[PDB]
Amino acid sequence: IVGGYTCGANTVPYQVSLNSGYHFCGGSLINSQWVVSAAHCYKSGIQVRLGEDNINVVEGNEQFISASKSIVHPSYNSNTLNNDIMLIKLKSAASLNSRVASISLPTSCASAGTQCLISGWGNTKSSGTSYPDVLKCLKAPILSDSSCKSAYPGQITSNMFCAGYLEGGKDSCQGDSGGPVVCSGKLQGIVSWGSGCAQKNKPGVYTKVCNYVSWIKQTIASN
Ligand SMILES: [Ca+2]
């Protein structure tokens, strides 16, 4: 996260680190047994890490749980990142507590201007690399469809939205992928892609979760 702030330990309790020897993507807990993340985060042998703040330090509220199964969206296109969403089922159910809490799925889409909390352990530098050890947060609005598609002509689908600031300086970044975009108490977005981080006229692109709710709920119910 570039130009965000330290969330504070466990203030985003649905936030998950996906670990395969090291943190490589964020994810969002959606019930005790299921995490949503970006399909481009797909990797064999994920351990989901819940309750994390410092990802480098055991602070005492962690649960580490192996994935039993990943289901990438049927229509996921890795070239375009269209349908950039996947479900990861936990080998055993997370123990839900104040630090490990699921986030509601949307019952409808949010509109342009709605303020969202984006969080993650990705790069905090606009040009260079510094990765934080504690979870970073950014409040950012949903951008207009038109400003989204204007920034990335020929790349934005009805399954994607932009959030952030056209002026740049504040964005999600490498390491944040898969992570939550929460607006008004719902998971509206997943950290998907972008052109660099926090650049002018290059806001973050997010998987539009509200298009996927029936898919998630059917899939979870059948798995
Ligand atoms: Ca930790």
Curated annotation (Swiss-Prot):
Q: Where in the cell is the protein located?
A: Secreted, Extracellular space
Q: Active-site residues? A: H40 (charge relay system), D84 (charge relay system), S177 (charge relay system)
Question: How is the activity of this chain controlled?
Answer: Is inhibited by scorpion cyclotide trypsin inhibitor TopI1.
Q: Peptidase S1 domain: which residues? A: 1-221
Work out whether the entry's keyword set contains Ribonucleoprotein: no
| Keywords annotated in UniProt | Calcium, Digestion, Disulfide bond, Hydrolase, Metal-binding, Protease, Secreted, Serine protease, Signal, Zymogen
The UniProt entry lists the main location of this chain as secreted
> Could you say which tissues express the protein in this record?
Synthesized in the acinar cells of the pancreas.
Write the Enzyme Commission number(s) for this entry. Answer: 3.4.21.4
Give residues annotated as binding substrate.
D171, S172, Q174, G175, S177
Query: By its UniProt entry, which Pfam families does this protein fall under?
Result: Trypsin
Reactions this protein catalyses = Preferential cleavage: Arg-|-Xaa, Lys-|-Xaa
Q: Name one GO cellular component term.
A: serine protease inhibitor complex
User: Which cofactors are reported in the record for this sequence?
Assistant: Ca(2+)
Question: Might you name a Gene Ontology BP term for this protein?
Answer: digestion
This protein is called: Serine protease 1
Organism expressing this protein natively: Bos taurus
